[PDB]
Design a protein around this ligand. Structure first.
Ligand SMILES: [Zn+2]
Lengths: 89, 1111, 49, 53, 49, 99
């Protein structure tokens, strides 16, 4: 299980993130889902910073680090003829 | 008629219809409250039988409950779907961009079988959107409309395609369920059977019946009468049940060890266990009515049965045998007949309740999977349905459906007719249904079952013809998802008044006469031979006794928007289609004047349009404003009605709501109290009434081009207010934060005059193209300076000013006033997306005049751009000095077969002038069928022709004969309908009389500024080095393939090289060409384009040594 | 595939099919120094105008 | 509606001066399996012995 | 049908040794770029996976 | 035979590539499955955007930042290991993977 979690930390993201940041992201997401169930709404970052005992700007930096990239090989149009990358100035 | 605020519009109605037009948004509202389980629905469906009314949510909960562990040792149940109140009002949602919704509370109940408890929590299931009283949904502030979707109903479908190489009819069957598995019982090319299941390519009946568990003798005693089945029974090659089961398991699961017991149960699970195979209640009703199985008992047990399977096979072998009818044992005999995939008995309509129900069912599927998961992994006697239920896939499913879907579209509202047209819309494309390109030609056509149900006129004329129609006026949706249709039933020749909602199959049971049937005012027909419609679309002259149904009115076939065209019966369907399709594309004028000539639909359609404030409760006016009317009810209470003034619609058009009553007025319930965008005095108004002539003038009205008078510019007769909303956000970054302020490095102070202390402009500031709206600057950081810039900053004493300015500049060709500023802030606790600090939106508005190039059209398909706006003097003007307003073309009229515009022109001059026929010798013979209070008419009086009961040739011409003069004794227009015009340019009279009159025309949303587009040097792409395209940018023009063909065909090789290289992809070439132009030098040699080098690098990347050689 | 079972664009997928490099190059290129508008009749003008 | 991005790389604009450059050295690096690589270093630069060629 | 491809390898200066592959090339990265958007939303080109 | 493609084209010969030619084309071996740092947003060494291999992203600026002028051109700084040049050779330069 250690080696498989090592692999899921290393080779599962296109931008490589070190393992401690991956684990605190996973902890943040687990706490976010659990407080979504219990609180009934999506939590505020100040509440999550209260929960994981860090600062809200640290929460925002973790949220910035948690965003996975997107592909340029889907069509924005419902009629599919133009790639998404055909609109980038 | 019979609406208390209706203005006196006079009709030509010869026939008095009993049925009135229903509440046209019932197709949305009743479906949605069916899904809710409103008490309104609860009583209403119970008023037509329906001993057990079940809501859609109630149906999903009952078909899901109970949930069970694999052991059978504990169970979960749901109960009591109840709604809360909404979380915000409508206008507050629409302003603050919150979606309009209401929470769900569901009483769950967990039971341990091992010890025995109930666990009754009240589960917050999640937010749930609500249909507004306009029949729409508001999502994230945007306003969306769910489109109704046609699919084929689940059931048993029958056909044959005879093989021309074989000359044998090949009868086939697709037993299609909902959410199930395929099975088809064909007849092969040989004398065998095609019992292929879920595409497993090859099966006889014997493997299925011994797989069912019949003996050969049990096959014999039912199937006794065909050499077909006897040949297949001698092609059995496997006798014994378990051998057939393992053969099925082999052919179904290959790559799997066989077991004989699970093979019988998996087959029992795949077709009879109703948790993985669920043809609906409608599918069960369709099959049971098709084979006469449950003729005396209501619908349950939504899976199949072996009785139904053997009845299917027997019907198949008799239909491949040739029979007329057959009774199954225990069943009423059904006629041996095949099936259509286009008749409306087979093609149901998934409404919005069906769609939301399916989305909630597929969300609860994943939620149920999670419940099955943590039923075992969690501990026992410590869990609770709070711990069990995760609501996230369900609420994600709902949010995914209301967004990002084929069926969830924007409310297409440039005018309330297009609102009422995007509602009540039928689509055959989407998820579940057929796609566009895979679908053939036959479903695009019009079966005769469309009559009275789906309008055979109104459809888009693009690459969607036939796929998207609308409802008829009087159509209504069956609780089984079919399209029912009213009929006046006629008994013994006497027409009764029992209105009977008939659907498509029971239409074919009977035979139906028409609205233009002569009645003796006591029901009875006077013709012994009457027009009638037979089941296959046949028309006969019936002996006048067998008819059991008559139409409720005329125009029962037609849509709403198409029923707003006078003289429809004179126009061909092509230009009528074009006119009805453009009639949803009118724009709101600043005046909105009612037409002189119309139908009886303009009042009822506008009060059902939503965008007319209707007096809800009868009372008296207390105090008015331009923004609200305080009504004084007749018992106590008072009520305001907040007018929406200058609201932006979804396409830039305005949404003013002016009141139309005074302070002392007394109003009643159901009365119009405030006109909307395209309304006047209650009824519809999509344009203006203009004096028109039909001469060809100077080649300016060449081939549907239209000229105008300058008076339309002078009096603002065609003038719309366009409102455009711009947007910019303050966003976090690594280098700091985006800042909205006046400090905007490098720039004059004069261009910073209109903005406030913090960068945004103030209300009322006229902007041009390319000005500053939101003064906003971003941090950039430090790079090296070029030494020339270093010298210049050394000379001028300027700092670096390290921050970089990206202010919100207004784009090209857009100007006008600035009405309103809505601004959101993260620090002010507003909700914002992530990393965003301040979101400001600016309402920009302008008042566009009419202009040469604008697209105008009448109500008949006669469309066209504006050729030339002539001045007011150079105009063919009438003998009184009145100029004509617009001038159409003659040559476009006869070849387009649309003379309804000519009849509208004659009728419009008749209505403008006003008439009073002579009754000195009584009624003249032409005006006999013409009803009373029509013998006179005041000038500029509103009239109405109903669609298929309108003015005849005798009535129109005879009324045109007597057309009393205006101010002096001036009979301007003769009996023929023409008049003598004078040339405003030359001065001589025209040698021939010219057809004149008043036609009601429209202004369309295909304006010039919305289409003009040009670029010298703008933004490029990122991946390729091509110029970026689209009017949102500066944008380029696709020099396509046939263009390359044409310039090869001239042989202009150098210009082709120009266009392919140094305007597209020669990255080092573009700058040198721009430089050589500005220096005024020779245009240099075109280099190697980028798209070739990309291909070269990809071929080198694909392990292919591409070599380039000169010798 | 990737997210939501959409198959990944391979290297050979750049050249083949609808969005293939050959055909999309053969289809057309948007160009600079161009423009468009709706047209109206010009009945007084010369033929070479 | 318009969306833009940025390849994170600086685009400087000077002239391709072919004549006036900083003068430079060339160091011969050899790998294991008899392969020669010559790497252009600056004059004012210490030449490292080990190298990833 | 075999002599077609056999004489194809024979006549040219090719070698069937290159049919198997030992070193795989890599396309230049600007052809498959990872461009950021406004806010760090990255846009890969699906070859990088 | 001209890869710089100066306008005298006559033929276009497609040919199968040897592994010798493949390693002849490349300017380095990528050997780490990295793209870019999440934090500093600069490309990683031995990755799929490696400026040591593929080239500089900043016009005439090396990775370590020792040299930042166009007069410094056609040299390789000993620390960063990058050939300082114009930043469009990343359109042309290929890498390889020894398997
Ligand atoms: Zn460096």
């Amino acid at each position: 299980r250690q080696a498989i979690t090592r692999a899921m930390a290393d080779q599962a993201r296109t931008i490589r993130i070190p393992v401690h940041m991956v684990e605190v992201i996973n902890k943040l997401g687990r706490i976010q889902r659990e407080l979504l169930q219990d609180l009934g709404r999506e939590p505020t970052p100040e509440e999550l910073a209260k929960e994981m005992d860090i600062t809200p700007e640290k929460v925002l930096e973790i949220q910035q680090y948690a965003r996975e990239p997107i592909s340029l090989d889907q069509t924005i149009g419902d009629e599919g003829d133009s790639q998404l990358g055909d609109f980038i100035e | 008629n019979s609406v208390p605020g209706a203005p006196n519009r006079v009709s030509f109605a010869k026939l008095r219809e009993p049925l009135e037009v229903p509440g046209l948004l019932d197709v949305q509202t009743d479906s949605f409250e069916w899904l809710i389980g409103s008490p309104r629905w609860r009583e209403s469906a119970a008023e037509r039988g329906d001993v057990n009314p079940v809501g859609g949510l109630e149906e999903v909960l009952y078909e899901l409950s109970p949930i069970e562990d694999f052991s059978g040792s504990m169970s979960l149940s749901f109960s009591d779907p109840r709604f809360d109140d909404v979380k915000a009002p409508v206008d507050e949602c629409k302003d603050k961009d919150m979606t309009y919704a209401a929470p769900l509370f569901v009483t769950a109940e967990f039971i341990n079988n091992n010890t025995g408890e109930i666990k009754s929590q009240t589960v917050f299931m999640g937010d749930f959107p609500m249909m507004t009283e306009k029949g729409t949904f508001i999502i994230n502030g945007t306003e969306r409309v769910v489109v109704s979707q046609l699919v084929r109903s689940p059931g048993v479908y029958f056909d044959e395609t005879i093989d021309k190489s074989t000359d044998k009819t090949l009868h086939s069957v697709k037993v299609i369920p909902s959410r199930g598995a395929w099975l088809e019982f064909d007849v092969d090319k040989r004398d065998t059977v095609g019992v292929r299941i879920d595409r497993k390519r090859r099966q006889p009946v014997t493997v299925l019946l011994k797989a069912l568990g019949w003996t050969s003798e049990q096959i014999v005693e039912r199937f006794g009468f065909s050499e077909i089945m006897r040949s297949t029974l001698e092609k059995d090659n496997t006798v014994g049940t378990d051998e057939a089961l393992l053969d099925i398991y082999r052919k179904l699961r290959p790559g799997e060890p066989p077991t004989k017991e699970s093979a019988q149960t998996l087959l029992e699970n795949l077709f009879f266990k109703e948790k993985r195979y669920d043809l609906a209640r409608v599918g069960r009703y369709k099959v049971n009515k098709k084979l006469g199985l449950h003729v005396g008992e209501p619908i349950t047990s939504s899976t199949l049965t072996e009785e139904d399977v053997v009845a299917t096979i027997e019907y198949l072998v008799r239909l491949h045998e040739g029979q007329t009818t057959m009774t199954v044992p225990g069943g009423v005999e059904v006629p041996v007949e095949t099936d259509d995939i286009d008749h409306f008995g087979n093609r149901r309509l998934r409404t919005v309740g069906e769609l939301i129900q399916n989305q909630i069912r597929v969300g609860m599927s994943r939620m149920e999977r999670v419940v099955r998961e943590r039923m075992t992994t969690q501990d026992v006697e410590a869990i609770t349905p709070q711990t069990l239920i995760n609501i996230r896939p369900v609420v994600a499913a709902i949010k995914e459906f209301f967004g990002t879907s084929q069926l969830s579209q924007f409310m297409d509202q440039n005018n309330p007719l297009s609102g009422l047209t995007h509602k009540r819309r039928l689509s055959a494309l989407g998820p579940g249904g057929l796609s566009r390109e895979r679908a053939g030609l036959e479903v695009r056509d019009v079966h005769p079952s469309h009559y009275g149900r789906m309008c055979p006129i109104e459809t888009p004329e693009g690459p969607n013809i036939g796929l998207i129609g609308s409802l008829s006026v009087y159509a209504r949706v069956n609780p089984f998802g079919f399209i029912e249709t009213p009929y006046r039933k006629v008994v013994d020749g006497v027409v009764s008044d029992e209105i009977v909602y008939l659907t498509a199959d029971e239409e074919d049971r009977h035979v139906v006469a028409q609205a233009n049937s002569p009645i003796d005012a006591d029901g009875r027909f006077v013709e012994p031979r009457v027009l009638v419609r037979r089941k296959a679309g046949e028309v006969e002259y019936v002996p006048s006794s067998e008819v059991d149904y008559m139409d409720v009115s005329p125009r029962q076939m037609v849509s709403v928007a198409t029923a707003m065209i006078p003289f429809l019966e004179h126009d061909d369907a092509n230009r009528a289609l074009m006119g009805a399709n453009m009639q949803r594309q009118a724009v709101p004028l600043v005046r909105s004047e009612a037409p002189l000539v119309g139908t009886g639909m303009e009042l009822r359609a506008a009060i059902d349009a939503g965008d007319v404030v209707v007096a809800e409760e009868s009372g008296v006016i207390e105090e008015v404003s331009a923004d609200y009317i305080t009504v004084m009810h007749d018992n106590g209470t008072r009520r305001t009605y907040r007018m929406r003034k200058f609201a932006r619609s979804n396409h830039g058009t305005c949404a003013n709501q002016c009141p139309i009553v005074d302070a002392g007025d007394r109003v009643e319930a159901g009365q119009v109290i405030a006109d909307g965008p395209c309304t006047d005095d209650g009824e519809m108004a999509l344009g203006k009434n203009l004096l028109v002539a039909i001469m060809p003038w100077e080649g300016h009205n060449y081939e549907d081009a239209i000229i105008l008078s300058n008076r339309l510019v002078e009096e603002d007769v065609l003038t719309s207010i366009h409102i455009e909303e711009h947007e910019i956000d303050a966003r976090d970054t690594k280098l700091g934060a985006e800042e909205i302020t006046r400090d905007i490095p490098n720039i004059s102070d004069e261009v910073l005059a209109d903005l406030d202390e913090r960068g945004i402009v103030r209300i009322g500031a006229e902007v041009r193209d390319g000005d500053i709206l939101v003064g906003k600057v971003t941090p950039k950081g430090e790079t090296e300076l070029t030494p020339e810039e270093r010298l210049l900053r050394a000379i001028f004493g300027e700092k670096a000013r390290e921050v970089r300015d990206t202010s919100l500049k207004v784009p090209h060709g857009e100007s006008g006033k600035v009405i309103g500023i809505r601004v959101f802030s993260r620090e002010d606790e507003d909700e914002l997306p992530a990393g965003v600090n301040e979101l400001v939106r600016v309402y920009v508005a302008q008042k566009r005049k009419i202009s040469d190039g604008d697209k105008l059209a009448g109500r008949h398909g006669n469309k066209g751009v504006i050729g030339k706006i002539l001045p007011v003097e150079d105009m063919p003007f009438l003998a009184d000095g009145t100029p004509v307003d617009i001038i159409l073309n003659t040559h476009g009229v006869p070849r387009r077969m649309n003379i309804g515009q000519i009849l509208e022109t004659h009728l419009g001059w008749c209505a403008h002038s006003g008439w009073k026929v002579d009754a000195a010798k009584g009624v003249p013979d032409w005006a006999a069928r013409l009803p009373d209070e029509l013998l006179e008419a005041q000038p500029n009086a509103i009239v109405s022709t109903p669609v298929f009961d309108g003015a005849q040739e005798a009535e129109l011409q005879g009324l045109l004969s007597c057309t009393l003069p205006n101010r002096d004794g001036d009979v301007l227009v003769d009996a023929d309908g023409k008049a003598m015009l004078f040339d405003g340019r030359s001065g001589e009279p025209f040698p021939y009389p010219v057809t004149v009159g008043y036609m009601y025309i429209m202004k369309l949303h295909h304006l010039v500024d919305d289409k003009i587009h040009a670029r010298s040097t703008g933004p490029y792409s990122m991946i390729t080095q091509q110029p970026l395209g689209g009017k949102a940018q500066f944008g380029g023009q696709r020099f396509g393939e046939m263009e390359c063909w044409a310039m090869q065909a001239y042989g202009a090789a150098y210009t082709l090289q120009e266009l392919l290289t140094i305007k597209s992809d020669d990255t080092v070439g573009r700058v040198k060409v721009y430089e050589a132009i500005v220096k005024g030098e020779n245009i240099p040699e075109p280099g190697i384009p980028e798209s070739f080098k990309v291909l070269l690098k990809e071929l080198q990347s694909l392990c292919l040594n591409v070599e380039v050689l000169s010798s | 595939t990737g997210p939501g079972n959409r198959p990944l664009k391979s290297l050979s997928d750049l050249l083949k099919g609808k969005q293939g490099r050959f055909r999309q190059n053969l289809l057309g290129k948007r160009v600079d120094y161009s423009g468009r508008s709706v047209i109206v009749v010009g009945p007084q003008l010369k033929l070479h105008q | 509606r318009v969306l833009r991005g940025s390849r994170l790389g600086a685009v400087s604009y000077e002239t391709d001066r072919n004549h006036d450059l900083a003068p430079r050295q060339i160091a011969r690096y050899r790998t294991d399996n008899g392969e020669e690589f010559e790497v252009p270093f600056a004059d004012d630069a210490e030449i490292p012995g080990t190298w990833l060629c | 049908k075999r002599l077609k491809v056999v004489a194809a390898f024979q006549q040219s200066g090719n070698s069937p040794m290159g049919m198997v592959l030992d070193a795989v090339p890599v396309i230049p990265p600007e052809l498959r770029p990872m461009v950021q958007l406004d806010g760090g939303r990255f846009a890969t080109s699906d070859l990088n996976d | 035979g001209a890869m710089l493609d100066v306008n005298f084209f006559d033929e276009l010969r497609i040919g199968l590539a040897t592994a010798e030619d493949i390693r002849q084309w490349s300017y380095g071996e990528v050997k780490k499955p990295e793209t870019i740092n999440y934090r500093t947003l600069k490309p990683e060494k031995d990755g799929l955007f490696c400026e040591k291999i593929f080239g500089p992203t900043r016009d005439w600026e090396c990775y370590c930042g020792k040299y930042k002028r166009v007069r410094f051109k056609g040299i390789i700084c000993e620390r960063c290991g990058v050939e300082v040049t114009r930043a469009k050779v990343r359109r042309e330069r290929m890498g390889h993977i020894e398997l």
